[PDB]
Design a binder for this molecule. Structure first.
Ligand SMILES: Nc1ncnc2c1ncn2[C@@H]1O[C@H](COP(=O)(O)OP(=O)(O)OP(O)(O)=S)[C@@H](O)[C@H]1O
Lengths: 1302, 139, 140
């Protein structure tokens, strides 16, 4: 009812009955959903206005935390519900609103919550089903209803309604099920074959009608015949209605047909496969595929089964036998089936073992259609046969490496010219790194030849003209103008429009550009994760949206291009284009000031280049700009060159640049750049013996002096000092703290300013502070040296805590508040206990987070600690009278949870814990928001807001669920020592059960979970990781009991061994338990003897069921392709990170697969550094690789391109080596974790564990360590791991454990 | 040419690139290029390339963390086997033996000796076959 | 003041090492043509191609400046690319068509096509043509 009102009072009256900008946005989000599409268009116009009204403030809503804004998330939902309109205009208005929004990083977007593509399966057996009859009624509705408006169609439609009445009474359970309404108003009135496609078949339907006459004879079912006679008259009335009828009719045809007639029908289907009317034939092939889908539904009926039902299954098998999967693939290329086509190709490969090269030729075409990131290269690596050189050039194009081999594509053209299209690819090579002169040479060459492509090259030249920003180039463009337009070429036409000053006439052309975007939008509708896939096309639309804002000024919201870029995802593939569009906008501007304004955009592009390599392109970018010299800008270009190599040469150039920059004066950015140059010089100083560390420290000290304000200079200096500090003792130890305190104080000041690297650095700083506290206590026990000297260090530590208190923030606390548990277990006491009080202050800032840490603390006896935690609670109670009351209610609830956790097929909490159920019902205990694992993780502050962003930010920010308690009667899990999980109903109403198992060190695992979703967040940060879209699932753990922690279990989670068991059951293959017992292994088994017996037993035991599992996992072929991407995500890099950790040795049972999205699961990985692996059998394999799991992994190729990409992710993963080290330090630091296996010692460390930490550092190095002599390559380390996975020797070494035939 | 030939040299170009893993893929590719599992070639020119490829594979193996010292020795033994006469096959082998020898001593001079003699014998045979690595061999 | 004489001196030397020293010696980095002289000492084709492109972007008044880009095409040594550069050059040099045609003729020698040789043969240049004139003798 609520709507925007021209008159405020009428809106106000509506508002009072109904009952700031973000709330308005929330109303707007409700507005974006539209009861009426016409109503939605008015809303969309209002929404675009709202974004304009938000202006800079809308950008401020967009940027505040590194984590994407929740309000943006409502905006993100708005994008999902945005430009997806059947009306082209409606979609265009939504697109225009998205352009004002701009493009969020796909990694930045956090909306994986929505169910999106996943849904209960549409398919039903049909015809017998009342709902299937309802679908037939729906067929009568809509287009049949339009036929009903035609008089001739209506008489047949009325008869069809009468036939439906004959099948079921119009009156009444079926009538109650029926929607009725407009349909109800219809209901009262109701109460030789070259012919297919060609000749008589015409546009599909006519061919179908001849088939239908054949079909009624083929199927003898009495019900089928009565429906068919009615169906044929309706089929004449609507071709589309006939097609819907045909899938059901086909199912009847499969059930009954003449054996010869069925062979003829199969032959006809092959003939269509072998083969608006042409589109109808493609649709008919799709209809045949739909019939195949119907056959799959019949197969599903067969699956429900377990003579005629078996015989029908045999007949369906015969229908499949008549079908050729390879034939289906040939049809699929005509189809542009793509992922659906690939699923058919995979099935053919599965059905018959094939030579890879025969397989390879189909595969190379399939890869080209796929546009897979692995694309041709994964296939090329897979191929055992050298590629054709032209094929290799195509593979180079598939790589899109650019740079080297661009000439190679030209060289194939040089050897011979057979393809104008090959020449066009050469022309893209001719464009090379955006070189105008090359284009000028290209245009004359295009002129000498006569081709349609040469005009297309001219369009590329027009884009070059846009780079030129030359009116004469635009005049050259105008002769070129008037051609079919590529999306870039249309952009060139828009550039022609900018010269045109068309204004509204140009805007209609922009709408035409929007229509091309709308075609992208049609591509955009699809399975979940489509939006990231379509993000690049969306980005071109986003560039168009930026262009429209620029156009309005030309025709005459801050909309900073830089402000937009930080929000925007950066893509090696697309970021350079996005920068290019911004450069094009700068070229468009005629503003006088802009003579010096344009270059910084090239320099920012150069920074993007440094991330993207393409260093020669980056040098080219400096050539592309130039002038408006900035000493820092030249220095930055040198820094990128230095990163590539020649750091010493670059450093000398930088030294020249610094002299050029100034005869320190901040000079705005340049002094900060000078400090940054100094930081590069310091890195060079670490690199060069000639550079002197003491001199650098003075230089570092000078850099700190140049800007007190910049945290980053201080942080770099703090890191430099830490490198100065790490060997400052040089093993001297002894005195170290007074220098360390100065570094810590610098670290705190940098933290107070805040840093992009600050959160990792702060975690390290907190760890160092903890290390100092432990060190002082260790010195104190000895009495060595001076107690007073240590006391002065303690006072400095107190001073640092006070400095934090002046600058201390709950946001500042972050990880340290989680770490405090290690801090609580401290012998020192005194100042360390006083620091704990600051941790207590952080607990005061958020109660729920404080409670979660406290609950773990309470379960450990912690008698000195239990008193200390109580003292922290008492101090909090003193700090707030309200806080003390909340804590007391929380403690009782935790105690109640603990009693339930001890729990001294469906276990009912009310039935045994009558009091516990009563307490949950009671509101007398203070109401508590339900704990969330996502809630536990800290929110991340935006890089953009320098000051108070953390204070504004929630320490963790999310809508907060409040526990509603749990159902009095619930199912209880049954297992030996089974955890029992009950999920509390949400205040919203979503309920998650949590199961707690006794004697489990969950808290050490919980840090491991903390060691995760930070790297996963880092993956979200990585452009490559976003391109992979390899999201990592995070387990939710609440082990308040030291013995027991209750964890919610994802629906459809399957134990990998259980899923394997399900596959064995599906095979019906049985391996005797006694037979496994009959097999005997000596503990000292001969490795060869064990392997030979194992391989033979396994092959009978596990013919791979992986192909079967994928088909079962998704009914949809498209769903299966998405699942294949999901399989690639499963294990892979996530498995690699655990291998990189070296802690895990997860059981195959521990590994799990989730049915809805397919997720690999790792849980209860108690072993750290493979201590469990060292125990009993030891396996060096990076990940468990059951051949069937590998077989799903093998896919078209058993070797996994995705697996190689996961390794690529792992190399990316070791980018923050220090951050990883800090996380490792934390894992060693916590008391609850034991390096070597509560009340007795309230306040475990292994030297071997420290060595293991060194081993993790060695893993970052990638050095083998185990190998004699030898020097480490990250790509190689992944390859070696792949080799280890390939070897079955480790599996032979393993006893029990994965124990997998596959 | 069906034999990797210059393509085997291209792996050397990959060595100029300096990525060992790419080289390792090349090493697998070269054996396939002469034959799916090519032996050092019967044609003498092909054999010199086949041995050289094995030598390149051995140098790559020495670089590779995933190498077996016994396996590297077997390849070196094979390299001597493909041509007793060629100086180059022994010279790579002689170099291989020396790298093996420092590890072999394992900090004991006394244990070293019979292995040293075999290496010296290969060196002497190589010196007769050619002097190109001989000056290095002579020291 | 020494540097302007020095840049001329380096050219007379025709020595890369002397040129490299001059580039380090100069207070201000060489730009445009001065950058291009530095590129020849650098000896790197990709940098040279970029330098030629940058020089063309500032202005395209020199056939020789086009020729340096053609030299970069020669460094690329791709026959299809060389032909593409030649076709663009012939239209661009209305005043001096075929000035780089002799460079194209060397490319034709690389092409090893008699018909390609014929197009160069049809072209007439009052130049020694270096190896390419010898190539013309090779052409018959
Ligand atoms: N939804 C789920 N799907 C699959 N595995 C789950 C799920 N929830 C929990 N798990 C894990 O699998 C176990 C299920 O119990 P069982 O494996 O039958 O025996 P258990 O001895 O209680 O547990 P372990 O330690 O896993 S053998 C839980 O204890 C979890 O470790």
């Amino acid at each position: 009812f609520l709507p925007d009102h021209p008159e405020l009072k009428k809106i106000k009256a509506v508002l009072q009955e109904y009952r700031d900008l973000q709330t308005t946005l929330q109303l707007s989000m409700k507005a974006i959903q539209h009861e009426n599409v016409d109503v939605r268009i008015h809303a969309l116009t209002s929404l675009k206005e709202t974004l304009y009204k938000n202006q800079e403030k809308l950008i401020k809503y967009a940027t505040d935390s590194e984590t994407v804004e929740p309000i943006i998330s409502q905006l993100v939902t708005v994008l999902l519900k945005g430009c997806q309109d059947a009306n082209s205009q409606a979609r265009l208005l939504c697109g225009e609103c998205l352009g004002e929004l701009g493009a969020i990083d796909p990694g930045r977007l956090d909306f994986s919550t929505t169910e999106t593509q996943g849904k209960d399966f549409t398919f039903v057996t049909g015809v017998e089903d009342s709902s299937f009859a309802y679908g037939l009624l729906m067929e009568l509705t809509r287009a049949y209803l339009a036929y009903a408006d035609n008089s001739r169609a209506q008489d047949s439609a009325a008869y069809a309604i009468q036939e439906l009445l004959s099948i079921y009474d119009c009156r009444h359970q079926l009538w109650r099920r029926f929607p009725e309404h407009v349909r109800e108003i219809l209901e009262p009135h109701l109460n030789k074959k070259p012919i297919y496609l060609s000749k008589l078949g015409s546009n599909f339907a006519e061919w179908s009608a001849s088939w239908a006459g054949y079909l009624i004879t083929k199927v003898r079912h009495d019900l089928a015949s009565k429906i068919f006679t009615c169906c044929s008259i309706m089929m004449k009335h609507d071709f589309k209605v006939t097609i819907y009828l045909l899938p059901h009719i086909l199912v009847y045809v499969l059930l009954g047909c003449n054996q010869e007639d069925q062979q003829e029908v199969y032959a006809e289907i092959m003939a269509v496969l072998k083969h608006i009317a042409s589109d109808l034939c493609q649709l008919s092939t799709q209809t045949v595929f739909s019939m195949l889908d119907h056959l799959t539904q019949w197969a599903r009926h067969k699956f429900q089964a377990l003579t005629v039902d078996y015989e029908d299954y045999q007949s369906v098998t015969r229908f499949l036998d008549l079908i050729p999967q390879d034939t289906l693939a040939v049809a699929s290329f005509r189809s542009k089936a793509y992922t659906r086509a690939v699923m058919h190709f995979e099935s053919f490969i599965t059905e018959k073992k094939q030579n890879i090269q025969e397989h390879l030729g189909f595969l190379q075409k399939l890869y080209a259609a796929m546009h897979e990131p692995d694309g041709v290269a994964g296939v090329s690596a897979i191929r055992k046969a050298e590629p054709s050189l032209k094929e290799q050039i195509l593979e180079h194009e598939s790589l899109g490496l650019l740079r080297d081999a661009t000439a190679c594509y030209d060289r194939a053209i040089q050897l011979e010219p057979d393809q104008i299209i090959h020449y066009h690819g050469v022309v893209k090579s001719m464009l090379g790194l955006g070189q105008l002169s090359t284009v000028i040479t290209q245009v004359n060459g295009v002129h000498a030849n006569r081709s349609e492509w040469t005009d297309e090259l001219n369009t590329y030249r027009v884009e070059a003209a846009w780079k030129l920003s030359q009116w004469d180039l635009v005049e050259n463009y105008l002769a070129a103008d008037g051609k079919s337009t590529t999306w870039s070429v249309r952009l060139g036409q828009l550039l022609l429009s900018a010269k045109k000053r068309d204004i509204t006439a140009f805007y209609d052309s922009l709408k035409l550009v929007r229509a091309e975007q709308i075609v992208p939008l049609s591509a955009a509708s699809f399975e979940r994760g489509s939006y990231q896939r379509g993000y690049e096309y969306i980005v071109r639309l986003h560039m168009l949206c930026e262009l429209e804002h620029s156009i309005k000024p030309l025709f005459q919201d801050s909309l900073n291009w830089v402000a937009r870029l930080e929000m925007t995802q950066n893509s090696y593939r697309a970021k350079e284009p996005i920068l290019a569009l911004r450069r094009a906008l700068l070229s468009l501007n005629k503003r006088p000031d802009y003579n010096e304004m344009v270059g910084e955009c090239w320099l920012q592009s150069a920074r993007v280049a440094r991330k993207a390599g393409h260093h020669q392109t980056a040098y080219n970018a400096l050539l592309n700009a130039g002038e408006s010299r900035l000493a820092e800008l030249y220095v930055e270009r040198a820094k990128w060159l230095w990163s590539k190599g020649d750091v010493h040469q670059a450093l000398i150039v930088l030294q020249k640049g610094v002299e050029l920059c100034f005869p320190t004066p901040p000079e705005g950015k340049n002094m900060l750049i000078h400090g940054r140059a100094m930081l590069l010089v310091g890195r060079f100083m670490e690199e060069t013996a000639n550079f002197e560390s003491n001199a650098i420290m003075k230089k570092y000290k000078d850099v700190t002096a140049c800007l007190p304000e910049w945290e980053d200079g201080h942080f770099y200096l703090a890191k430099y000092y830490d490198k100065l500090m790490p060997m400052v003792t040089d093993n001297k130890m002894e005195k170290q703290g007074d220098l360390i305190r100065y570094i810590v104080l610098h670290f705190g000041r940098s933290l107070q300013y805040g840093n992009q690297f600050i959160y990792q650095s702060m975690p390290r700083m907190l760890t160092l502070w903890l290390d100092y506290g432990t060190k002082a206590y260790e010195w104190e026990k000895a009495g060595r040296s001076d107690r007073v000297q240590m006391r002065n260090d303690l006072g400095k530590i107190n001073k640092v805590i006070t400095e934090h208190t002046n600058y201390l923030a709950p946001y500042q606390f972050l990880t340290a508040f989680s770490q405090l548990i290690s801090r609580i277990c401290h012998s020192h006491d005194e100042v360390f206990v006083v620091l704990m009080e600051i941790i207590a202050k952080v607990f005061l800032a958020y109660p729920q987070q404080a409670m979660w840490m406290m609950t773990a603390v309470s379960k450990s006896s912690y008698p000195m600690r239990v008193n200390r935690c109580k003292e922290i609670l008492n101090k909090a109670i003193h700090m707030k009278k309200s806080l003390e009351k909340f804590v007391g209610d929380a403690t009782r609830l935790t105690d109640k949870l603990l009693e339930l956790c001890n729990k001294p097929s469906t276990l009912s909490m009310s039935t045994h814990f009558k009091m516990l159920k009563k307490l949950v019902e009671e509101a007398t205990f203070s109401e508590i928001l339900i704990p969330l694992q996502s809630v536990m993780i800290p929110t991340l502050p935006s890089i953009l807001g320098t000051h108070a962003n953390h204070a504004s930010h929630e320490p963790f920010p999310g809508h907060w669920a409040y526990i509603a308690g749990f159902d009095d009667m619930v199912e209880i899990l049954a297992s030996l020592q089974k955890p029992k999980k009950i999920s509390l109903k949400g205040s919203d109403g979503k309920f998650y059960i949590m199961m707690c198992k006794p004697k489990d060190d969950l808290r050490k695992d919980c840090r491991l979970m903390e060691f995760n979703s930070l790297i996963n967040k880092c993956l979200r940060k990585d452009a490559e990781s976003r391109r992979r879209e390899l999201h990592i699932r995070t387990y939710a753990v609440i082990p308040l009991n030291d013995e027991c922690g209750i964890i919610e279990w994802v629906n459809n989670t399957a134990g990998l061994r259980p899923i394997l068991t399900k596959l064995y059951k599906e095979k019906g293959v049985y391996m005797t338990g006694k037979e496994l017992r009959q097999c005997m292994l000596p503990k000292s088994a001969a490795l060869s003897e064990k392997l030979k017996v194992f391989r033979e037993f396994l092959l009978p035991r596990h013919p791979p069921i992986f192909h079967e599992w994928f088909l079962r996992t998704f009914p949809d072929p498209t769903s299966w392709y998405s699942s294949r991407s999901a399989y690639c995500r499963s294990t892979a890099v996530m498995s690699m990170v655990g291998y990189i950790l070296g802690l895990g040795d997860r059981h195959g049972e521990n590994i799990l697969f989730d049915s809805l999205t397919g997720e690999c699961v790792h849980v209860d990985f108690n072993c750290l550094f493979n201590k469990g692996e060292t125990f009993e059998v030891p396996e060096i394999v990076p990940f468990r690789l059951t051949h069937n799991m590998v077989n799903g992994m093998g896919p078209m190729g058993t070797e996994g391109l995705f697996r190689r990409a996961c390794e690529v992710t792992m190399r990316l993963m070791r980018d923050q080596r220090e951050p990883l080290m800090s996380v490792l330090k934390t894992f060693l630091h916590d008391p609850l974790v034991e390096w070597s296996k509560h009340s007795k010692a309230p306040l475990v460390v292994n030297e071997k564990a420290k060595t293991h930490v060194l081993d993790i550092e060695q893993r970052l190095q990638g050095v083998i360590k185990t190998r004699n002599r030898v020097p480490l390559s990250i790509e190689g380390h992944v390859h070696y791991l792949i080799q280890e996975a390939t070897d079955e020797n480790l599996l032979c070494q393993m006893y029990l454990g994965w124990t997998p035939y596959m | 040419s069906r034999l990797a030939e210059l393509y085997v040299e291209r792996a050397k170009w990959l060595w100029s690139k300096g990525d060992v893993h790419q080289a390792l893929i090349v090493l697998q590719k070269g054996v396939e290029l002469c034959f799916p599992e090519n032996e050092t070639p019967p044609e003498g020119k092909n054999m010199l390339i086949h041995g050289r490829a094995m030598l390149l594979v051995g140098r790559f193996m020495e670089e590779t963390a995933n190498f077996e010292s016994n396996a590297i020795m077997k390849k070196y033994k094979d390299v001597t086997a493909c041509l007793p006469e060629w100086e180059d096959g022994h010279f790579y082998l002689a170099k291989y033996y020396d790298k093996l020898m420092p590890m072999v001593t394992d900090n004991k001079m006394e244990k070293q000796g019979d292995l040293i003699r075999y290496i010296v014998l290969h060196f002497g045979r190589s010196l007769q076959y050619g002097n190109q690595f001989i000056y290095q061999s002579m020291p």
